[PDB]
Structure formats: structure tokens, C-alpha cells
């Protein structure tokens, strides 16, 4: 048993708050916000040795990242930003920081009861996305 055991699995989005405004804050245009906002992605988290893989799949877009904790990597986000990302574990929370064009946003992933809770923060705007086991 290891670092991210309680995250591993397939998770389905069930609820969202303030995600349109989060997207606005990160620069997403109107049409992409409206289409992406409908999506109910599946987030599939797996671990192989030190490598964590997070796949996020929806009608809108499929994304896949693999990484080692603390080790920066290139990411193309679902909204097509080209960012430098680092993911760390801080007190049992996966903390995903994305840097691009002098800007920064943080996505936190946390296990809470039987849910996986995702908080996306850009400046003063926070959005919460709640996932259940698929
Ligand atoms: C893979 O399908 C989707 C569907 C819906 C939203 C997202 C998504 C995630 C995510 O769920 O990993 C994280 C961050 C985002 C930031 C901006 C964004 O603008 C469209 C979309 C984001 C991905
Ligand atoms: C790419 O990754 C990072 C990591 C840490 C810091 C920054 C960063 C910040 C920031 O987020 O505080 C602000 C302004 C910057 C201006 C130039 C810059 O050189 C590429 C990096 C800047 C970027």
C-alpha cells in the first residue's frame, strides 16, 4: 500500500459549483465554457511504482497526465493552455499547480468520505467539483 491508494480508481463528476467563473478566470472563451460546462468527466487515477496517471475523459475532451510527485512536467490542459505543472502530496491532498504566461492556478484533489473533491482556484475564484466512484 502506498502514496495515493485512496485516490486510485474511476470517479464520475456528480456536482459542480462556480466552474464557469473559474474557467472565465483562467481565460476560457464563451463557446468552450458552455460546451465544457455540460461535461460529466470520468477521472481515472492509477499508480505504477512512482508514476501516477490521471486520465480525464468526457464528451468534450480526453486528457491524460503521468507524473512523479514534485517533478515538473509539460501539460496541455483541456482548454488548450500549454502549462508547466507540478503535482505534490501535501498532507494527503494532491496539489496540482499550473504555471503559464506569468499566471498560476491550483487544483486540489482530496478524499472526503466516499467522495473525491476537487477544488480549482484562480486568484479570488474557487470552484468545487465533487466526484463519486463510478
Ligand atoms: C477532460 O474533460 C474535461 C471536461 C470538463 C472540464 C475539464 C477540466 C479539468 C478536469 O476536469 O481535469 C480541469 C481543469 C480545467 C480547466 C479549464 C477547462 O476549461 C474547459 C476545463 C478543465 C476537463
Ligand atoms: C514556469 O513556472 C514558474 C514557476 C514559478 C514561478 C513562475 C513565475 C511566476 C509565478 O507563478 O509566481 C510569476 C512570474 C514569472 C515570470 C517569469 C517566469 O519565467 C518563466 C516565471 C514566473 C513560473
Amino acid at each position: 500500500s502506498h502514496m495515493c491508494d485512496a485516490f486510485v480508481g474511476t470517479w464520475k463528476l456528480v456536482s459542480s459549483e462556480n466552474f464557469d467563473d473559474y474557467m472565465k478566470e483562467v481565460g476560457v472563451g464563451f463557446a468552450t465554457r458552455k460546451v465544457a460546462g455540460m461535461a460529466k468527466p470520468n477521472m481515472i487515477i492509477s499508480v505504477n511504482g512512482d508514476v501516477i496517471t490521471i486520465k480525464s475523459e468526457s464528451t468534450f475532451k480526453n486528457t491524460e497526465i503521468s507524473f512523479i510527485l514534485g517533478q515538473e512536467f509539460d501539460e496541455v490542459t483541456a482548454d488548450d493552455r500549454k502549462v508547466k505543472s507540478t503535482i505534490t502530496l501535501d498532507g494527503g491532498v494532491l496539489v496540482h499547480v499550473q504555471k503559464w504566461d506569468g499566471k498560476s492556478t491550483t487544483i486540489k484533489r482530496k478524499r472526503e468520505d466516499d467522495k473525491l473533491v476537487v477544488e480549482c482556484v484562480m486568484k479570488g475564484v474557487t470552484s468545487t467539483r465533487v466526484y463519486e466512484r463510478a
Side-chain angles (χ1 to χ4, degrees):
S1 293
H2 252 252
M3 60 211 176
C4 292
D5 280 358
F7 293 99
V8 171
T10 298
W11 297 95
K12 63 188 164 79
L13 185 67
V14 301
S15 74
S16 184
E17 187 198 20
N18 219 44
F19 192 64
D20 184 57
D21 277 340
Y22 173 78
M23 285 190 289
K24 283 183 178 184
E25 208 75 8
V26 161
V28 186
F30 178 90
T32 298
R33 292 200 314 277
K34 294 307 168 188
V35 173
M38 297 303 302
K40 302 281 182 157
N42 296 145
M43 188 194 16
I44 308 118
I45 303 176
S46 59
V47 179
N48 180 328
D50 294 336
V51 182
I52 304 167
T53 301
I54 302 179
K55 296 180 190 183
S56 314
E57 306 181 349
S58 73
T59 64
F60 167 63
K61 197 64 98 217
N62 300 317
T63 63
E64 175 178 331
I65 62 173
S66 291
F67 60 88
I68 296 171
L69 294 168
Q71 300 194 359
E72 186 167 57
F73 62 99
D74 293 315
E75 180 181 6
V76 179
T77 66
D79 60 313
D80 294 316
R81 287 173 283 125
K82 275 71 171 178
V83 308
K84 295 285 180 184
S85 288
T86 312
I87 302 176
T88 59
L89 208 40
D90 182 13
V93 177
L94 286 165
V95 182
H96 181 179
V97 182
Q98 300 175 334
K99 300 299 193 181
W100 77 110
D101 293 327
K103 302 170 184 168
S104 188
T105 188
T106 298
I107 302 169
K108 289 182 180 181
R109 292 170 173 91
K110 312 176 174 180
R111 276 294 313 271
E112 301 187 17
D113 299 317
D114 290 324
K115 300 183 178 176
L116 190 170
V117 175
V118 185
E119 293 165 349
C120 301
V121 174
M122 178 61 176
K123 298 185 270 186
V125 177
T126 307
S127 170
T128 295
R129 312 265 281 180
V130 180
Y131 297 70
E132 296 179 3
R133 296 262 192 196

